[PDB]
Write a protein that binds this ligand. Structure first.
Ligand code: CLA
Ligand code: CLA
Ligand code: CLA
Ligand code: CLA
Ligand code: CLA
Ligand code: CLA
Ligand code: CLA
Ligand SMILES: CCCCCCCCCCCCCCCC(=O)OC[C@H](COP(=O)(O)OC[C@@H](O)CO)OC(=O)CCCCCCCCCCCCCCC
Ligand SMILES: CC1=C(/C=C/C(C)=C/C=C/C(C)=C/C=C/C=C(C)/C=C/C=C(C)/C=C/C2=C(C)CCCC2(C)C)C(C)(C)CCC1
Ligand SMILES: CC1=C(/C=C/C(C)=C/C=C/C(C)=C/C=C/C=C(C)/C=C/C=C(C)/C=C/C2=C(C)CCCC2(C)C)C(C)(C)CCC1
Ligand SMILES: CC1=C(C/C=C(\C)CCC[C@H](C)CCC[C@H](C)CCCC(C)C)C(=O)c2ccccc2C1=O
Ligand code: SF4
Ligand code: SF4
Lengths: 60, 161, 132, 73, 137, 741, 80
């Protein structure tokens, strides 16, 4: 929704499913997955951020 | 009584085992001069064996056909001494431990260096938490009825849930 | 002729190269230097054009990566059949795959997240898996 | 053997075996029709499990039969 | 000097021209074996190979077989050699019928068939000759 | 002066700041733990200096000071051993009556009933019987008192402190520069002429002046109380002249060249001392003196600062023939620019040397009363055999590491390494063929014998009373060694060892050493040994040669030394790294050494060790059942494992019960290792995911996320537990089988 | 041959293309991503199945996926 806002993940395949992550950047220039989110826990690959579509995030 | 077990107080096989242990220790000590350090050690072993067998006889344990004590663990109060009483102690001690641990996890977890505080323990805070475990059952029940014990369904899961 | 100076090794190609596809790699070396063979120990690359033969495309691409990341040399890779046909393989349009090249067309692209694939039961008894 | 050591080692060994066969006089005449490769990972696990099970069952059957029939107990 | 150079002057082939691999001794010795000799009908190649391998095979069965200590050891060894030769000719026939399927060089259906017939005849000849020799020695 | 001392003063600051930052050494681990894998990595890369700094000087300074630390640890271990001998041992009682008194230098506190482990060894003493042969070593040194052991321990402690201080000083205060390390000629001169030359010379002096007279008095029956102190043998020459009437002449014969006058205490009689059952002390004195001379001479071979000497670079460059292109050109740079190459060579040599020590010490017992201590002989042999195998495999592993990391094709053009890499396929194919041939023939001999014995066809087996496979070459060599004294070694009174032939040396009615006859069983077992060694060499050599590339992975070197795989492509690419080759080679080395130890144990129990009667009759431990029972697998299963395992299984209720407990525990750990060896990481990762959900449901969730062990770590743990279980099982088996005596 | 598929979650960082040892993958122009590029697998006959591309993927779950299938000489990593 906005920079720095916490969002609950809804991507079923995501390692951070049902977890809270902070939005880093949002691309207003179209794009299918514009909302970059960062989570505290690192996934199995060691990364802690991913791009999601606004439909795949619960706002708060 | 219980399952055809005769109390170890009147168990001939129990006394035979005691005699065998004592006599074998005596045969072992017969090859040392009286008063030699080995002789004193063996005599102390004999005394400890006699005390162990006497304590078992006086305790009220139930012997089998083999002469060894058997434990009744069906909840019988007369035999709680065998399993119920120690078990409670365990569930207390471990409970304490567990509770304390959980608290530490939930105390240092609200920090940026939460990971760094697990390899390196905050000994002052750690002892602060550890000293509070003697009331772990009450605190656990209070958290349970207060909703602060369990996390909501909104937590990590897998594709098929 | 143009081959890098190499003393020979028992790791070269085998009968399938004669009977099946063989591979060739060409490049240009500004100077003469020693590089590690994908099969043998070491070889000296000639000044100017160097042509080398191998039995697997992976060997050619490993050697190409060595050249690119050590001696900053551009290279080309071809496949030769027993019939004499020669096919150009690695630079498909003169520009490496890492760099975008207008004109390329996507292949094997799915327009949905990986988690939206159909269930195996839906595609059953047809000669297809969920991805296809 | 199949449960501990996995494929890569065996494939690299079969490479040298293929080379040796192809470079032998009086044996180059005879050539395989199917290219010889190491067992697949799943196949190797299955074969190791099969050997484990067969050996287990045979040894225990031998023990249980022989002891009982030898001491009549 | 340098006695190890790439085979066929091709550095990129998986071989080397070592003294064992490419020397007058080995080239002449292998080039005169029936399997590689020039101007031999495949039947003759098979016959030579069979004669070599039949006489060669009676001895192990004769001397190390279960009947080695009996007065009929030699005949049992000969029969075992004959059976093994029959097995090997079966192997050769199936290999020929599987490999070369779609008189000449030995790598053909008819060439290999003639080679196998020659091999059988020569192997039985070698076994019989070994028996004849060992019968009185 | 090309060879010179170069150091950096105050190279590193001494502070505890780093001690509170675990993982500081490596750049990746310094960021702190995100998952538990980090933890494991911190213990795996701790001593991987080469991967922590790109400078060779820094790696060299770390290695030097780590070696100082290891020396400190070894000195502390020696101090502990000597102190437990002085305060907690029956060394004096054993001295008085070595045959009957069982050595023991460990005592257990009575806390849970474990005092049963305090055996009735003797000498009015109770403790755990030791099998380290320390009592025999101390007797050979003429200790004869516990004050000397106490002071030996104190000196060892002071030396450990000095080693620790030297390590600290040579890292943090005066760190030698790289040019200082790269002095192979000077280092070899100093290690040969002084470390090994003057070490031998000093020990020979000790033996001549201390051990010889004291041991001669002890053999004469003098009680240790009446033996004068060792220093008394240095002040009054006559006191030694009574024992060896050649000191009377003094040192004048030595300088005059009349060394023959010293034949009283510098002998070449060989054989074994009939009284103590060990080697003659005079023989060992002459041995060490000759070795000191040779080492001092050899330490002047290399050129350091004065023109005279050998330049190993030129030496290597000079040796090149037609078959090997450039010859040994570039090996000096390899061995002076990479610690992994040097470590590979040194570990291989140390392992082979340890195995040679194990073989030589049993055949010619060097210490008094060690031959008849069957428990000590077996323990020492097996210990040093295991150490040798481990060191050999480690040398292989570090050769592979060098090949992956420190190998540079530019500096290795058409030299020996290049050519070996270029006919690696032929090498491995032929080693594979010879391994298969050896395995087939040798093990099929056993299978054939077993099949024939099961079918009742005993006349068709490979046995002495059947088809015979006599080790004719070994028997011929034994005969030549038997005939050597007087003909090919005219000045040697007796054969080197009684194994080859001769009388039966028995001490106190126990057969210290006797000739060992080789039969068909010896032939078969020796070929089994050769088969296993060839297979282990196959695995390790294949790991070394194919460490950089292969027809599967042309770019294996970029993947590193140890990596799990390269994916399921190309069929499957599991265990393709050289580290995995070491992982398999460790299993095969363990198997081969297990066979070696079983061969030694059964052969010695059935053919050498035993008892003698006053007439001279011999009665061995197992009655010589090796010849007709070591030729079938069932024979090994029944007459060796099942039969000799009675002691362990029946040790409960005695001082050896600890051995039975360790037997079971080793079995348990060995079986436990299979969990890691067979299973894969994905299952455990998913199980941990479920367990983590369970923890999270109660708001218990470690910040350091749990992770299943990496694939490489899974294999390493499985192998470590497998080796521990096997080694412990055989350890308990041998010690309980050879301590019930 | 193995089947290599690229999903629209890709962020066009090129890492999969770089990691590929057999030059199966490449970059093609695209508009659904910020970088304007997407990975493609035009020539999967040369894919060996090492799954290096998947290992070198930043996206939460493997915008590039490899499914092993029929094995040929090329995909079986055989020099013979
Ligand atoms: C304080 C930490 C803590 C707490 C509260 C729990 C609590 C629990 N664990 Mg977990 N667990 C822990 C640590 C902890 N565990 C650790 C360190 C390990 C790794 C060895 C595991 C591995 C583990 C497994 C594999 C399983 C559980 C299970 C369980 C549940 C049943 C009890 C049990 O089986 O214990 C088992 C405990 C162990 C096997 C090891 C415990 C080791 C020590 C005693 C705990 C750590 C104490 C630590 C020093 C805290 C110090 C605090 C101080 C700094 C102030 C329960 C939710 C089970 C479950 O899911 O039930 C539904 C289950 O299957 N646990
Ligand atoms: C299960 C079926 C089976 C049967 C019936 C036999 C039968 C026999 N085996 Mg055994 N064997 C078998 C399986 C079998 N084998 C297997 C599976 C193995 C591998 C583990 C072996 C390994 C084996 C060894 C290692 C040896 C035998 C030997 C023998 C012979 C015992 C010696 C004797 O008295 O004959 C005396 C033998 C002769 C007089 C020679 C006659 C040989 C045959 C019968 C002539 C006809 C063959 C025929 C043309 C072949 C047709 C080919 C094709 C159509 C199938 C006997 C014929 C021994 C032997 O042959 O001694 C040399 C021997 O040393 N066998
Ligand atoms: C180096 C080899 C070695 C070995 C294997 C042993 C082993 C043993 N010794 Mg011997 N000893 C040694 C060297 C050795 N010692 C040396 C060099 C000396 C001379 C000082 C002695 C002097 C000695 C005596 C005088 C006695 C023993 C005894 C013992 C036994 C009991 C030890 C024990 O648990 O007590 C209890 C020990 C402890 C509880 C250890 C303390 C725990 C510390 C505080 C843990 C700290 C770890 C720390 C957190 C790690 C991080 C570092 C930190 C400092 C920063 C045991 C068999 C005793 C024995 O056999 O009784 C019959 C006995 O009386 N030893
Ligand atoms: C490093 C070893 C070492 C050490 C420290 C000593 C030290 C000593 N030796 Mg010994 N010795 C040694 C090795 C050693 N020796 C060896 C290898 C041999 C065999 C040849 C001898 C044979 C020997 C004899 C035969 C005698 C000594 C004697 C002596 C003492 C007088 C020294 C003297 O006058 O020489 C002068 C010093 C130099 C030339 C320098 C002295 C304590 C003498 C003794 O016991 O009198 C007290 C004596 O008679 N030594
Ligand atoms: C010449 C004096 C001498 C004497 C009396 C001994 C005595 C002994 N040695 Mg030693 N040894 C010596 C010299 C000597 N050694 C030298 C010079 C070497 C170097 C190769 C060795 C290497 C050696 C080994 C590796 C072992 C022994 C062992 C033994 C013991 C075995 C029993 C026996 O009868 O030995 C008889 C000894 C022999 C028959 C060996 C004689 C070796 C000759 C002298 C080699 C000479 C090489 C020559 C000088 C080369 C010069 C080249 C140079 C100019 C370039 C015994 C105490 C064994 C032992 O103690 O195990 C417990 C053992 O394993 N010795
Ligand atoms: C001179 C001896 C020597 C030296 C200096 C080294 C040094 C090194 N080795 Mg080499 N190695 C050696 C001997 C040696 N090794 C031997 C004998 C073997 C054969 C097994 C190996 C096999 C080997 C492999 C396969 C590898 C190394 C690696 C390494 C490096 C990292 C080591 C490390 O981090 O330790 C970490 C140490 C530990 C984690 C401690 C574990 C110790 C074992 C597993 C447990 C011991 C159990 C104990 C004895 C008994 C337990 C009793 C039980 C009841 C509790 C380092 C350069 C690694 C590397 O990458 O280097 C580049 C690597 O991959 N080495
Ligand atoms: C007891 C079980 C066992 C057996 C029999 C083998 C057998 C073998 N291993 Mg394996 N291995 C095992 C356990 C075993 N291993 C385990 C537990 C591990 C884990 C560490 C390994 C790891 C391992 C590696 C890493 C390597 C081997 C290698 C070898 C080979 C050595 C060469 C050889 O002897 O060929 C001869 C074959 C035998 C002796 C097997 C017995 C055959 C008998 C004698 C005859 C059988 C009857 C006959 C075939 C009848 C035919 C007819 C019948 C079909 C009806 C051989 C295939 C090496 C290899 O393949 O290269 C040479 C190698 O590199 N193994
Ligand atoms: C010690 C080893 C003894 C056997 C060595 C065999 C001759 C070895 C020998 O004479 O090598 C000598 C040969 C000659 O090399 P150059 O003299 O040109 O090399 C000069 C050297 O100083 C190195 O630069 O080297 C090779 O060809 C190596 C590859 C050998 C190919 C043959 C290998 C056969 C191995 C199996 C033989 C086993 C026999 C039983 C072993 C107990
Ligand atoms: C010298 C030597 C060697 C080798 C050797 C060999 C290898 C040998 C072989 C041998 C052989 C391999 C022989 C063979 C022979 C054969 C024969 C001799 C044959 C004959 C035949 C015949 C006579 C036939 C006849 C017939 C027929 C054809 C058919 C039927 C009818 C008849 C009967 C007429 C070497 C150098 C390594 C080393 C040293 C020694
Ligand atoms: C066991 C030990 C110990 C101790 C030890 C000791 C005590 C040792 C000693 C040692 C010694 C005590 C040594 C010495 C040495 C010496 C020497 C080595 C010498 C040499 C000399 C020379 C070489 C000479 C030469 C010459 C002369 C004669 C003069 C003239 C000229 C000339 C120069 C030629 C302790 C307890 C600490 C601990 C543990 C270890
Ligand atoms: C059991 C198992 C696990 C799970 C094992 C784990 C996570 C190890 C757990 C270690 C515990 C937490 C430490 C305590 C262990 C003992 C109580 C004592 C310490 C032992 C040493 C670490 C010193 C794997 O991750 C694995 C991965 C790949 C192949 C096989 C396997 C495998 O077999
Ligand atoms: S099974 Fe494990 S080791 Fe084998 S290819 Fe797959 S990930 Fe790699
Ligand atoms: S590695 Fe993944 S995110 Fe990067 S370009 Fe390839 S498919 Fe896209």
């Amino acid at each position: 929704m906005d920079k720095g806002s916490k969002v609950r993940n809804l991507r079923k395949e995501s390692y951070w499913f049902n977890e809270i992550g902070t939005v880093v950047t949002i691309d207003k220039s179209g794009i299918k997955y514009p909302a970059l989110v960062r989570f505290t826990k690192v996934n199995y690959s060691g990364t802690n951020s991913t791009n999601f579509s606004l439909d795949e995030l619960q706002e708060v | 009584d219980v399952a055809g077990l005769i109390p170890c107080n009147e168990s001939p096989v129990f006394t035979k085992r005691l005699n065998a242990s004592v006599v074998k220790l005596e045969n072992r000590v017969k090859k040392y001069e009286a008063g030699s350090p080995p002789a004193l050690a063996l005599e102390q072993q004999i005394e400890r064996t006699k005390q162990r067998f006497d304590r078992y006889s006086k305790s009220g344990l139930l012997c089998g056909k083999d002469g060894l004590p058997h434990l009744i663990t069906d909840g019988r109060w007369s035999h709680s001494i065998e399993f119920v009483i120690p078990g409670l102690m365990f569930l207390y001690i471990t409970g304490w431990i567990g509770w304390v641990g959980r608290k530490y996890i939930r105390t240092v977890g609200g920090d940026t260096n939460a990971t760094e505080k697990e390899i390196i323990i905050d000994v002052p805070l750690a002892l602060k938490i550890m000293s509070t475990g003697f009331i772990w059952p009450i605190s656990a029940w209070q958290e349970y009825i207060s909703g602060t014990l369990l996390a909501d369904v909104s937590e990590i899961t897998v594709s098929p849930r | 002729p143009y081959s890098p100076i190499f003393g020979g090794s028992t790791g070269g190609w085998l009968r399938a190269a004669e009977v099946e596809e063989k591979y060739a790699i060409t490049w240009t070396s500004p100077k003469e230097q020693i590089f590690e063979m994908p099969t043998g120990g070491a070889a000296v690359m000639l000044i100017g054009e160097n042509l080398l033969y191998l039995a697997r495309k992976e060997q050619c691409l490993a050697l190409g990566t060595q050249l690119k990341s050590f001696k900053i040399s551009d290279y080309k890779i071809y496949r030769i059949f027993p019939s004499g046909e020669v096919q150009f393989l690695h630079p498909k349009d003169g520009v490496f795959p890492e760099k975008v090249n207008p004109g390329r067309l996507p292949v094997g692209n799915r327009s949905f997240s990986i988690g939206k694939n159909p269930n195996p039961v839906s595609v059953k008894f047809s000669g297809q898996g969920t991805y296809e | 053997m199949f449960l501990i050591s996995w494929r890569g080692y065996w494939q690299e060994l079969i490479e040298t075996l293929v080379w040796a066969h192809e470079r032998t006089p009086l044996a180059n005449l005879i050539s395989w029709k199917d290219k010889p490769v190491a067992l697949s990972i799943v196949q190797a696990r299955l074969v190791g499990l099969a050997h484990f099970t067969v050996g287990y069952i045979l040894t225990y059957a031998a023990f249980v039969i022989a002891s009982t029939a030898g001491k009549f107990g | 000097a340098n006695f190890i150079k790439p085979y066929n002057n091709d550095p990129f082939v998986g071989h080397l021209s070592t003294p064992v691999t490419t020397s007058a001794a080995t080239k002449a010795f292998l080039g005169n074996l029936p399997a590689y000799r020039a101007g031999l009908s495949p039947l003759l190649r098979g016959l030579e190979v069979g004669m070599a391998h039949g006489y060669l095979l009676v001895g192990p069965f004769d001397k190390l077989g279960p009947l080695r200590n009996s007065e009929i050891a030699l005949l049992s060894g000969f029969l075992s050699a004959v059976g093994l030769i029959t097995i090997l000719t079966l192997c050769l026939t199936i290999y020929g019928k599987v490999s070369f399927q779609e008189n000449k060089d030995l790598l053909t259906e008819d060439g290999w068939s003639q080679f196998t017939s020659g091999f059988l005849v020569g192997a039985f000849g070698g076994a019989g000759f070994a028996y004849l020799t060992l019968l009185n020695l | 002066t090309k060879v010179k001392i170069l150091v950096e003063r105050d190279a590193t600051a001494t502070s505890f700041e780093k001690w509170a930052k675990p993982g500081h050494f490596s750049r990746t681990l310094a960021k702190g733990p995100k998952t538990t894998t980090w933890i494991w990595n911190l213990h795996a890369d701790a001593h991987d200096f080469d991967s922590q700094t790109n400078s060779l000087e820094d790696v060299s300074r770390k290695i030097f000071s780590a070696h100082f630390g290891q020396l400190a640890v070894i000195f502390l271990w020696l101090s502990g051993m000597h102190f437990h001998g002085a305060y907690f041992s029956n060394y004096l009682a054993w001295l008085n009556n070595p045959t009957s008194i069982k050595p023991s230098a460990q005592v257990v506190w009575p806390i849970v009933g474990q005092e049963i482990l305090n055996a009735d060894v003797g000498g009015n003493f109770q403790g755990v019987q030791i099998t380290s042969g320390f009592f025999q070593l101390w007797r050979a040194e003429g200790i004869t008192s516990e004050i000397q052991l106490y002071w030996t321990a104190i000196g060892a402690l002071v030396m450990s402190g000095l080693m620790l201080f030297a390590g600290w000083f040579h890292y943090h205060k005066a760190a030698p520069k790289l040019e200082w390390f790269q002095n192979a000629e000077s280092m070899l001169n100093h290690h040969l002429s002084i470390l090994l030359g003057l070490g031998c010379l000093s020990w020979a002096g000790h033996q001549i002046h201390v051990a010889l007279p004291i041991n001669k008095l002890l053999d004469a029956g003098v009680a240790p109380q009446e033996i004068p102190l060792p220093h008394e043998f240095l002040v009054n020459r006559d006191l030694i002249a009574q024992l060896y009437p050649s000191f009377s002449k003094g040192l004048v014969p030595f300088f005059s060249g009349n060394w023959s006058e010293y034949s009283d205490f510098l002998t070449f009689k060989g054989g074994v001392n009939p009284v103590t059952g060990g080697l003659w002390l005079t023989d060992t004195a002459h041995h060490h003196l000759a070795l000191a001379v040779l080492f001092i001479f050899a330490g002047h071979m290399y050129r350091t600062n004065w023109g005279i000497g050998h330049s190993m670079k030129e030496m290597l460059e000079a040796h090149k023939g037609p078959f090997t292109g450039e010859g040994h050109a570039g090996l000096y740079e390899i061995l002076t620019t990479s610690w992994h190459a040097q470590l590979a060579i040194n570990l291989a040599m140390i392992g082979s040397l340890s195995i040679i020590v194990a073989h030589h010490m049993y055949a010619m017992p060097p210490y008094p009363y060690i031959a008849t201590d069957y428990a000590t002989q077996l323990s020492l042999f097996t210990h040093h055999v295991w150490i040798g195998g481990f060191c050999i495999v480690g040398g292989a592993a570090h050769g592979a590491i060098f090949m992956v990391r420190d190998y540079n094709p530019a500096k290795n053009y058409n030299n020996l390494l290049d050519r070996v890499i270029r006919h690696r396929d032929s090498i491995i194919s032929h080693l594979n063929w010879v391994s298969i041939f050896l395995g087939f023939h040798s093990f099929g001999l056993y299978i054939h014998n077993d099949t024939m014995r099961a079918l009742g066809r005993s006349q068709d087996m490979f046995s002495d009373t059947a088809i015979q496979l006599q080790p004719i070459f070994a028997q011929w060599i034994q005969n030549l060694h038997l005939l050597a004294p007087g003909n090919t070694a005219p000045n040697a009174l007796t054969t080197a060892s009684y194994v080859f032939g001769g009388d039966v040396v028995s001490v106190g009615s126990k057969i210290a050493i006797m000739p060992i006859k080789l039969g068909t069983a010896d032939f078969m077992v020796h070929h089994i040994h050769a088969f296993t060694i060839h297979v282990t060499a196959l695995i390790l050599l294949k790991g070394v040669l194919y460490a950089r590339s292969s027809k599967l992975i042309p770019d294996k070197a970029n993947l590193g030394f140890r990596f799990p795989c390269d994916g399921p492509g190309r069929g499957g690419t599991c265990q393709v790294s050289a580290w995995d080759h070491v992982f398999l080679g460790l299993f095969w080395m363990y198997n081969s050494l297990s066979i070696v130890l079983f061969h030694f144990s059964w052969k010695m129990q059935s053919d050498v060790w035993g008892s003698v009667t006053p007439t001279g009759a011999v009665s061995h431990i197992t009655g010589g059942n090796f010849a007709q029972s070591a030729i079938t697998i069932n024979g090994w299963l029944r007459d060796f494992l099942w039969s000799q395992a009675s002691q362990v299984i029946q040790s409960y209720g005695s001082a050896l019960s600890a051995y039975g407990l360790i037997f079971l525990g080793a079995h348990f750990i060995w079986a436990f290792s299979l969990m890691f060896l067979f299973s894969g990481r994905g299952y455990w990762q998913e199980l941990i995911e479920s367990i983590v959900w369970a923890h999270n449901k109660i708001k218990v969730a470690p910040a350091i996320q749990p992770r299943a062990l990496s694939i490489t770590q899974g294999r390493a743990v499985g192998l470590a537990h497998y080796l521990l279980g096997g080694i412990g099982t055989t350890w308990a088996f041998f010690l309980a089988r050879i301590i019930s005596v | 041959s193995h089947a290599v598929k690229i999903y629209d979650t890709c962020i066009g960082c090129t890492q999969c293309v770089r990691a590929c040892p057999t030059d199966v993958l490449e970059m093609v122009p695209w508009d659904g991503c910020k970088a304007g590029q997407i990975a493609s697998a035009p020539r999967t006959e040369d894919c060996v199945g090492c799954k290096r591309c998947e290992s070198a993927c930043p996206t939460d779950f493997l915008s590039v996926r490899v499914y092993l299938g029929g094995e040929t000489t090329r995909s079986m990593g055989l020099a013979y």
